[PDB]
Amino acid sequence: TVKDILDAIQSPDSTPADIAALPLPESYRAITVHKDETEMFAGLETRDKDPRKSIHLDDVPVPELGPGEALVAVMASSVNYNSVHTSIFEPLSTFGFLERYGRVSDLAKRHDLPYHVIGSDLAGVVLRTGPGVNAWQAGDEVVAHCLSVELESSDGHNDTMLDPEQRIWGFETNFGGLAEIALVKSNQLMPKPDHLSWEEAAAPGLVNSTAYRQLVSRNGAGMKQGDNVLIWGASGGLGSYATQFALAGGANPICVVSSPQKAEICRAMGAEAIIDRNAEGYRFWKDENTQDPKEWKRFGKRIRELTGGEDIDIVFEHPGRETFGASVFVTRKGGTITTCASTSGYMHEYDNRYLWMSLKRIIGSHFANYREAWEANRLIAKGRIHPTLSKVYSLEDTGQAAYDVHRNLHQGKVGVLCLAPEEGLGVRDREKRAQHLDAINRFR
Amino acid sequence: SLTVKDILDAIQSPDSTPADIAALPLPESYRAITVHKDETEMFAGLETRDKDPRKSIHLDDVPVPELGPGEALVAVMASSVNYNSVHTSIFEPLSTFGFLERYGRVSDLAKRHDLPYHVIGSDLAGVVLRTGPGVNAWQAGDEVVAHCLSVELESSDGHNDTMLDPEQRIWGFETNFGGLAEIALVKSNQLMPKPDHLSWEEAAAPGLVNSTAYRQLVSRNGAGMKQGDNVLIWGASGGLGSYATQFALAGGANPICVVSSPQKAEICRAMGAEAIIDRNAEGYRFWKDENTQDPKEWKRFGKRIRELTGGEDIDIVFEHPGRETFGASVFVTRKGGTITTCASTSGYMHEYDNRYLWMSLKRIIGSHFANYREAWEANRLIAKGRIHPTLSKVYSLEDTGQAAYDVHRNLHQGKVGVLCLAPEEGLGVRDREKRAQHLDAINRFR
Amino acid sequence: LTVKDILDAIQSPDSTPADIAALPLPESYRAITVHKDETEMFAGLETRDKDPRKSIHLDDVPVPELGPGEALVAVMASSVNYNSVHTSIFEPLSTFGFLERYGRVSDLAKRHDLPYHVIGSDLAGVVLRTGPGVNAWQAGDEVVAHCLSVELESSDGHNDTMLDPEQRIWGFETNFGGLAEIALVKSNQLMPKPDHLSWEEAAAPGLVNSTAYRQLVSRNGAGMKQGDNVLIWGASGGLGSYATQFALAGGANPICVVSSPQKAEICRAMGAEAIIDRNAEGYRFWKDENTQDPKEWKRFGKRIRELTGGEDIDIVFEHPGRETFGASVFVTRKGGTITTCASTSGYMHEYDNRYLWMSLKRIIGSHFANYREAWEANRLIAKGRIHPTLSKVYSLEDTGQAAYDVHRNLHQGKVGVLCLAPEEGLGVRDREKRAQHLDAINRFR
Amino acid sequence: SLTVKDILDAIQSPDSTPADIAALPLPESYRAITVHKDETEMFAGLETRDKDPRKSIHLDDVPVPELGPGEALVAVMASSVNYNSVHTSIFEPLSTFGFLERYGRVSDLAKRHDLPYHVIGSDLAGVVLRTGPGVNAWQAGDEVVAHCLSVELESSDGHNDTMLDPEQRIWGFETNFGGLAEIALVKSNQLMPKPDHLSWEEAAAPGLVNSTAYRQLVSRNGAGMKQGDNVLIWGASGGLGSYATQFALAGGANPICVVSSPQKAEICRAMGAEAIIDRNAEGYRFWKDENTQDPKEWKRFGKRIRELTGGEDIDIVFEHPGRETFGASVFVTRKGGTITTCASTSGYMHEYDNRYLWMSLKRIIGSHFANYREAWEANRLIAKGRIHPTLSKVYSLEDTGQAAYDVHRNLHQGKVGVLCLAPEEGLGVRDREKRAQHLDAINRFR
Ligand SMILES: [Cl-]
Ligand SMILES: [Cl-]
Ligand SMILES: [Cl-]
Ligand SMILES: [Cl-]
């Protein structure tokens, strides 16, 4: 049973030899969305859709292990926006892709199923290794990157994010991490940091690695110490990791939040310059087809007062349409606007005179390649960047967890215990954990 | 005193040397194409396209300005009409006298530009007459072209790429003493060597337009093109497009030329392009509605591109029409590709679908004129005969008003040239063998 | 079922991919080999006098087991590279040491740990069978291969594949090379054959062309601009003969260095005009074994400036190493690049750091190409912008002599080898395009 | 007329406007540290280490130079000793006068610098006295420090990064009127604002060295450091290394400091460095003798690094010792990593194994001083209190000889400072609250 696996992981006296020899259960507990139910939301608006009515907790058969892959006993995961989007079947259900992609080969076909096991983060222990897997073995304490790339095309051989056959694990693949067991490629695997618990270790993955590419990597903004970095939604999932990269890299974050409580979160992170966009009442759109340059100017005036007359070197974009005109306007001459999302709307509108005449640059970014994910996770291992857990749910209550994220109820990360019976487990370096406890817990 | 005629005489006589030009005294006045502070409101309540530059353009006799440190007075043999010269001609968006006036507060030397008249023009080919204090790289008698960037670099901002200087000025636009005249005043760090195999007007043709395309497409500050790239070029036979297309070809890349007519298409074929789209014949309506873009039209355009490339997307979009085409440019670029912009002629409020940008790791790079190193390299490529001037039409100085009109109303393809001091076309070639090597290419736009 | 039986099926249109894959693997295939028994054989001798004709065997060998990610290719043609010659003379040590030790990693790695070594690091041929999880390639596909074998289990190579710590060079650090009737490669080595070229022409560029691409054209190398003055050592050599074409196709200005008038003429045939015959000029950059001559640096720099009209070099395309590196550094422009992929004259470089830091220059190390770089390099061949540079072709049984030829640096450009191909000039699929580029294709012949 | 005391006092009084300070009569002479054209052969036949700067340095009374366009005259409160100041003391490799003579031929203003004496010094902190024509960024009364780069930028070479300008000069070394003096002449594009929380001597300390480290390590023209990098810093408690180490730490990177004593190691620990190698305690001998290197020592060194990093290699090597160390530097750096070099203090004939460079895709990047944007950014980091000055010792102006001697002999860690007009240490701080925050960091080297 799975309980044998849980007890074997927990016990201090267990070997790599031991963990290999335990038999796989016939099925495991999984968070699921169903294919027969994809029409369930019938003429409802998006915000009017409830993940609690579409999410199931099923017993599901263990998948066949292929070459290059790994079966992992999952202690914890988190809720990501992609997970929520899949719950609602928005813009469409995830079964479309799983079906079309399943046609390519028999290995691809494993994913084409009446249910979809979701989740794109994980922290656990490797149970089985596939053939051709050498860097990892059973018993290894791991977290997982969510990029699944095949690399048959040559397009990704100078940055795997350009691979045309890429898949986001647990979104465009089945067997995601919101379950007691998961199937991932071994080149998704990263070592779990010693000083964190399972759910803390699971919390950064997708979001932190995305922030890393966007802001720190040379494929993104390429931040340098001293830069003024404008960070929209600074207390949210993405923003919370971005703010930390800015601070830890010796740059100056200009945190934009929507409340005094969110502002206090950024001050705790260490940010000095904070704009509450709700208190200042910036209306970058007059009506939703006309923008207000006056408001862009007013906002840039506020930034200049906080920086002592400096503009923004790098804007960390993600709200999109509502905000994107201001972002382009406020950036310094020669500076960079970096974007990984458009949550308020994907039809961006900006004045190009401010872009071309001031030699600025808009850089698109999406997730992270494995080297980038490694590096970001490594910075978590070193205690430079910290997990941003605000609330932990049990696997039982992922439905509620997904609703909570859907209505933006919590700051930072929302995490899910999977196999872990209680919070706070899986800490190996008690000394280092104590050195950073205050920071690890800032969101809680 | 010494007239401009005496200077011509001495330029054109066979064995006149650098010694003889240096010895000539400065003339006291010169003929210059001008706009008057008097007349900035003469274009009333009229649409832009109904403003006639010929009403505002004067040919004046103007005094020679004081030659300052780090500067050169040049006898201008030829020049060209640029869009910026046309915008100054009508008074759009505002007249140029506002900036001359404000910048004129900054120093005694800056105040020289603050005049009741504005000598316009941002290109030149001619002969250095006299050199101000501290100028060493140039001397009287040198045959030169000019770049249009003037920088002070008092600020630290432009010390890693000079286009970042906040005190920059476009010569002939945000400075006075421009090149549509018999004499010009420039910084010595605007001067580049005149190509020997070209006549004066041909050497003055590429200037501003060629150096802009270079930075945008070739330079690492822009797109940083590579041989084998597919480069989508909007307006490919127009002034800017005509240089962009040549850079893509000379650099081993594959231009995908967009044009608006079959005669324009033939111009691209003459330059050596094979992948050509007549966007009017195909009837692209990227905007169904003044407020609404049509993604089916983006998709149809991308399909046409892929037929021409054999299934490949655009590595680099060379943008400049702006609002109308910008959504389409973002859509059709390859995953990890670049959209480079230096203008928005159809409208500066760009709208695009950011999903295509972030999800496929695309980049929009803003570009503007060229720093002087980029301008030197661009001009050097003309001197090498890798890239050719694209003159379609040449006017005399007296007829610059007509030239400005011709450009305002988009009458010609390529460049519109102006003879200044030069009494006729085709003068000033020193390397006739290299010229015969490239003559067909040099005359492609005639 | 023989290779002749394999060959006849290939050249038939009805032969389905599932049917070319239905063909049972022959007992054996013919293969160019080095024997572990024999690594000793040249002890005592100067490198110069070691004769690959004495160590190269043509053996009948079995087909290796096919794994995940891999393909078996019926090899119509290959080429001789310096790495194949090195192995054939067992220098600096033999290839067997690595084959053994790396064999320890997995059951699949052990397949290579054999008493013989099938050599060769280029190919052109037809896919015979694909292993588990290969989707982009299938039996019957007409392919060339790049020689980079990467595992990609480490994160190191996921922002540029040349950074993978577990890399091997196919046919040198792997067994089952391309100088043979059948080869085993990863499917991520496969690229489509240029239609307008014959098998041996299509095999010719791989290793060296892709190397030149990365070093000179790629942003991971020098990232050449049109207009750049590019100094190319050994410009009619195998590597130099592709670097020169990239400079020209890319609208740059190669300054070609050659060591003979015949080599100069070949550079003029490619389209180069600025040529320095370093031999006729008698450059002696080293006064003796331990002392450099900066006067000779300067003299060489003056000659460069005579050719460019007073301009220094934007990018030096280095590979001779010790003999030339001091001069390469000296003649580079302020802010310029020296790019290096080899050190044929000796790997201990000595240079004056004053010329490098005070003029803000860069030395950039490059090695082979990642798959995208290689795919792009091969695409430029396919478009007819870059041409193969065969000077000489040998049959499979004469690979010993071919190897000897390259060892002795006898020919210019590339030396090719017909493997399964029964004669020269077969395998062109676009005859009009070939007639367009024929004179260019045959320059080195 | 007025003496220097009278300006010093006039500066200090609060009813002095900029216009007042500017209206102040210049003195007939000012005190300046100098070297004499008379005496360039003084050290003939002596080994470098036996050459004594106290023997060649004079304290002279010197006339104020003519003020030119784009320039400022500065009352210098403090300066510092740099290696280049020391090299000019001992006239190695050749005296400075040669360059000063040759460049004097350029213009009348260039000729100002061509004198029988050379006022030395490439750092300063002080007060703007007088501003030349065209200067708008700065005015009399302004509290300033100086970057040591003077560029003309008449050539195009330097318009995408001014360190490529062929007419560059290092101020105080290739120019006269250096900063070891009571008055200095600089270009206004050398001036940066002085950090409020720092004393004059503290503000003068970073200048040349800090901006060098910045270009080399932080800038995209150098290694382009990121957070998480392993950075090997040779001579970590030295001038250059004292800033390099702070950049690595303040940018979230991991310095591996190489020092030559447990005392030097203690200072690295006070900076915040965790990984420290004492090359003396370990006894690395990278060379067996003068013509043969020892790779066994490279590997041994490599192993020690790997112990401190936990199995990781070096992303970025911060080089400057050169010959002794370069082989090891190239060996220890990670696949795809960078060696960045700005000097070769043990010898400029570098020998390294190219196999490690090409097979592992490594880069050697050369770097030299800083462009003005870089220097501005370096000094801004000091001002924001992210980076601190590393003064260990301070001399008065009359003891500059002794100061150059000490530096020549490598007696001190960090920076050696020099008071010029300041009558005592610790003057000139305006923000005592920021100072209090950073005091222990500021005095770490004392
Ligand atoms: Cl799959
Ligand atoms: Cl002016
Ligand atoms: Cl293998
Ligand atoms: Cl001067």
mmCIF file of C-alpha atoms in Angstrom, chain D residues 39-196:
data_model
loop_
_atom_site.group_PDB
_atom_site.id
_atom_site.type_symbol
_atom_site.label_atom_id
_atom_site.label_comp_id
_atom_site.label_asym_id
_atom_site.label_seq_id
_atom_site.Cartn_x
_atom_site.Cartn_y
_atom_site.Cartn_z
ATOM 1 C CA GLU D 39 64.593 63.816 -13.549
ATOM 2 C CA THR D 40 63.193 61.032 -15.708
ATOM 3 C CA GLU D 41 66.546 59.168 -15.844
ATOM 4 C CA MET D 42 66.899 59.316 -12.046
ATOM 5 C CA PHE D 43 66.381 55.565 -11.519
ATOM 6 C CA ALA D 44 68.508 54.273 -14.427
ATOM 7 C CA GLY D 45 69.959 50.807 -13.794
ATOM 8 C CA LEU D 46 67.897 50.138 -10.662
ATOM 9 C CA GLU D 47 65.421 47.257 -10.394
ATOM 10 C CA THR D 48 61.755 48.298 -10.242
ATOM 11 C CA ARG D 49 61.386 47.361 -6.543
ATOM 12 C CA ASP D 50 64.394 49.518 -5.589
ATOM 13 C CA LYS D 51 62.893 52.597 -7.266
ATOM 14 C CA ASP D 52 61.808 55.028 -4.558
ATOM 15 C CA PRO D 53 58.821 57.363 -5.253
ATOM 16 C CA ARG D 54 59.842 59.675 -2.357
ATOM 17 C CA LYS D 55 62.906 60.505 -4.429
ATOM 18 C CA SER D 56 60.990 61.689 -7.501
ATOM 19 C CA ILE D 57 57.911 63.306 -5.949
ATOM 20 C CA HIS D 58 57.922 67.045 -5.356
ATOM 21 C CA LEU D 59 55.475 69.318 -3.630
ATOM 22 C CA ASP D 60 55.293 72.320 -5.935
ATOM 23 C CA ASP D 61 53.443 75.637 -6.159
ATOM 24 C CA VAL D 62 51.898 75.712 -9.587
ATOM 25 C CA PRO D 63 49.930 78.221 -11.674
ATOM 26 C CA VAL D 64 46.226 77.514 -12.300
ATOM 27 C CA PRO D 65 45.747 76.187 -15.885
ATOM 28 C CA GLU D 66 43.557 77.980 -18.454
ATOM 29 C CA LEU D 67 39.923 76.777 -18.171
ATOM 30 C CA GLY D 68 38.436 75.455 -21.434
ATOM 31 C CA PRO D 69 34.973 74.665 -22.846
ATOM 32 C CA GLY D 70 33.304 71.631 -21.263
ATOM 33 C CA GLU D 71 35.674 71.721 -18.292
ATOM 34 C CA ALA D 72 35.668 72.479 -14.562
ATOM 35 C CA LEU D 73 38.143 73.651 -12.004
ATOM 36 C CA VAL D 74 37.700 71.946 -8.689
ATOM 37 C CA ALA D 75 38.908 72.683 -5.177
ATOM 38 C CA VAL D 76 40.246 69.245 -4.175
ATOM 39 C CA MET D 77 39.592 68.249 -0.570
ATOM 40 C CA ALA D 78 40.962 64.707 -0.971
ATOM 41 C CA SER D 79 42.389 62.220 -3.466
ATOM 42 C CA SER D 80 44.048 58.776 -3.422
ATOM 43 C CA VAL D 81 47.122 56.876 -4.604
ATOM 44 C CA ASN D 82 46.641 54.474 -7.502
ATOM 45 C CA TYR D 83 49.152 52.119 -9.177
ATOM 46 C CA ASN D 84 49.255 54.414 -12.260
ATOM 47 C CA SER D 85 50.354 57.301 -9.954
ATOM 48 C CA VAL D 86 53.049 55.027 -8.587
ATOM 49 C CA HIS D 87 54.201 53.982 -12.081
ATOM 50 C CA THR D 88 54.565 57.665 -13.085
ATOM 51 C CA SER D 89 56.624 58.326 -9.884
ATOM 52 C CA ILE D 90 59.227 55.812 -11.008
ATOM 53 C CA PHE D 91 58.868 56.664 -14.746
ATOM 54 C CA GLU D 92 58.008 53.082 -15.774
ATOM 55 C CA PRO D 93 57.872 51.707 -18.359
ATOM 56 C CA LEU D 94 58.614 55.184 -19.799
ATOM 57 C CA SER D 95 57.904 58.635 -18.358
ATOM 58 C CA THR D 96 54.466 60.251 -18.785
ATOM 59 C CA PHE D 97 55.962 63.316 -20.498
ATOM 60 C CA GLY D 98 56.321 61.550 -23.875
ATOM 61 C CA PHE D 99 52.569 61.140 -24.273
ATOM 62 C CA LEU D 100 51.956 64.645 -22.870
ATOM 63 C CA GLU D 101 54.334 66.108 -25.480
ATOM 64 C CA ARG D 102 52.861 64.165 -28.405
ATOM 65 C CA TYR D 103 49.250 64.812 -27.524
ATOM 66 C CA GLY D 104 50.136 68.503 -26.938
ATOM 67 C CA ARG D 105 50.550 68.761 -30.720
ATOM 68 C CA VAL D 106 46.795 68.101 -31.154
ATOM 69 C CA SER D 107 45.468 71.564 -30.236
ATOM 70 C CA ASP D 108 46.161 74.700 -28.197
ATOM 71 C CA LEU D 109 44.163 73.296 -25.295
ATOM 72 C CA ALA D 110 45.994 69.972 -25.535
ATOM 73 C CA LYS D 111 49.171 71.981 -25.240
ATOM 74 C CA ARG D 112 48.183 73.305 -21.798
ATOM 75 C CA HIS D 113 49.193 69.867 -20.450
ATOM 76 C CA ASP D 114 52.746 69.891 -21.958
ATOM 77 C CA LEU D 115 54.899 71.275 -19.107
ATOM 78 C CA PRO D 116 58.272 70.621 -17.316
ATOM 79 C CA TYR D 117 56.281 69.288 -14.380
ATOM 80 C CA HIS D 118 53.410 66.817 -14.188
ATOM 81 C CA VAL D 119 50.736 67.096 -11.490
ATOM 82 C CA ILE D 120 49.670 63.563 -10.695
ATOM 83 C CA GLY D 121 46.574 61.806 -9.378
ATOM 84 C CA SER D 122 43.568 60.055 -10.869
ATOM 85 C CA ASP D 123 40.981 60.425 -8.075
ATOM 86 C CA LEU D 124 39.319 63.279 -6.253
ATOM 87 C CA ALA D 125 36.666 64.574 -4.032
ATOM 88 C CA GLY D 126 35.930 68.266 -3.717
ATOM 89 C CA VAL D 127 33.988 71.361 -4.671
ATOM 90 C CA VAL D 128 33.400 72.880 -8.096
ATOM 91 C CA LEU D 129 35.099 76.284 -8.283
ATOM 92 C CA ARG D 130 34.697 77.348 -11.850
ATOM 93 C CA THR D 131 32.766 75.943 -14.757
ATOM 94 C CA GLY D 132 33.817 76.398 -18.411
ATOM 95 C CA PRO D 133 31.632 77.215 -21.445
ATOM 96 C CA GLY D 134 28.827 74.788 -22.274
ATOM 97 C CA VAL D 135 28.803 73.189 -18.835
ATOM 98 C CA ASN D 136 25.235 72.786 -17.585
ATOM 99 C CA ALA D 137 25.225 69.617 -15.491
ATOM 100 C CA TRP D 138 27.468 71.201 -12.815
ATOM 101 C CA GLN D 139 27.966 74.595 -11.118
ATOM 102 C CA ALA D 140 30.363 76.187 -8.591
ATOM 103 C CA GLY D 141 29.625 74.943 -5.063
ATOM 104 C CA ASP D 142 28.746 71.432 -6.306
ATOM 105 C CA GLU D 143 30.256 68.667 -4.142
ATOM 106 C CA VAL D 144 31.825 66.181 -6.530
ATOM 107 C CA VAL D 145 34.026 63.190 -7.154
ATOM 108 C CA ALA D 146 35.744 62.474 -10.458
ATOM 109 C CA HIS D 147 35.979 59.531 -12.894
ATOM 110 C CA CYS D 148 39.435 59.363 -14.468
ATOM 111 C CA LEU D 149 38.353 58.928 -18.122
ATOM 112 C CA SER D 150 38.753 61.746 -20.618
ATOM 113 C CA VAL D 151 37.442 60.993 -24.113
ATOM 114 C CA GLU D 152 37.199 63.226 -27.204
ATOM 115 C CA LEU D 153 34.874 60.984 -29.272
ATOM 116 C CA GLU D 154 35.761 62.663 -32.549
ATOM 117 C CA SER D 155 36.404 59.156 -33.925
ATOM 118 C CA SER D 156 33.338 56.926 -34.420
ATOM 119 C CA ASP D 157 35.010 53.973 -32.671
ATOM 120 C CA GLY D 158 33.797 55.024 -29.220
ATOM 121 C CA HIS D 159 30.122 55.859 -29.865
ATOM 122 C CA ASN D 160 28.771 52.465 -28.684
ATOM 123 C CA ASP D 161 31.005 52.295 -25.491
ATOM 124 C CA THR D 162 33.494 55.087 -24.992
ATOM 125 C CA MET D 163 36.373 52.915 -23.827
ATOM 126 C CA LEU D 164 36.942 52.137 -27.552
ATOM 127 C CA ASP D 165 37.760 55.798 -28.264
ATOM 128 C CA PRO D 166 41.360 55.833 -29.608
ATOM 129 C CA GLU D 167 41.894 59.394 -28.250
ATOM 130 C CA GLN D 168 41.086 58.445 -24.645
ATOM 131 C CA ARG D 169 43.249 59.768 -21.803
ATOM 132 C CA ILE D 170 43.462 58.747 -18.197
ATOM 133 C CA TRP D 171 43.224 61.973 -16.179
ATOM 134 C CA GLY D 172 46.315 62.702 -14.068
ATOM 135 C CA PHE D 173 48.362 60.160 -15.989
ATOM 136 C CA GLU D 174 47.882 61.010 -19.673
ATOM 137 C CA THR D 175 46.638 64.466 -18.705
ATOM 138 C CA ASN D 176 48.174 67.054 -16.421
ATOM 139 C CA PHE D 177 46.457 68.814 -13.480
ATOM 140 C CA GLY D 178 45.790 65.536 -11.674
ATOM 141 C CA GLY D 179 44.032 65.232 -8.331
ATOM 142 C CA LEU D 180 46.958 64.987 -5.886
ATOM 143 C CA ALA D 181 46.817 68.755 -5.426
ATOM 144 C CA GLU D 182 44.699 71.554 -4.014
ATOM 145 C CA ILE D 183 43.107 72.338 -7.409
ATOM 146 C CA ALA D 184 42.321 70.199 -10.414
ATOM 147 C CA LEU D 185 41.130 70.598 -13.963
ATOM 148 C CA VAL D 186 38.661 68.010 -15.293
ATOM 149 C CA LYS D 187 36.063 67.594 -18.013
ATOM 150 C CA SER D 188 32.536 68.064 -16.745
ATOM 151 C CA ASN D 189 31.786 64.543 -18.058
ATOM 152 C CA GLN D 190 34.165 63.284 -15.402
ATOM 153 C CA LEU D 191 32.133 64.746 -12.525
ATOM 154 C CA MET D 192 29.915 62.609 -10.353
ATOM 155 C CA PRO D 193 28.055 63.620 -7.199
ATOM 156 C CA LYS D 194 29.841 63.046 -3.874
ATOM 157 C CA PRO D 195 28.073 60.645 -1.417
ATOM 158 C CA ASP D 196 26.577 62.657 1.446
#
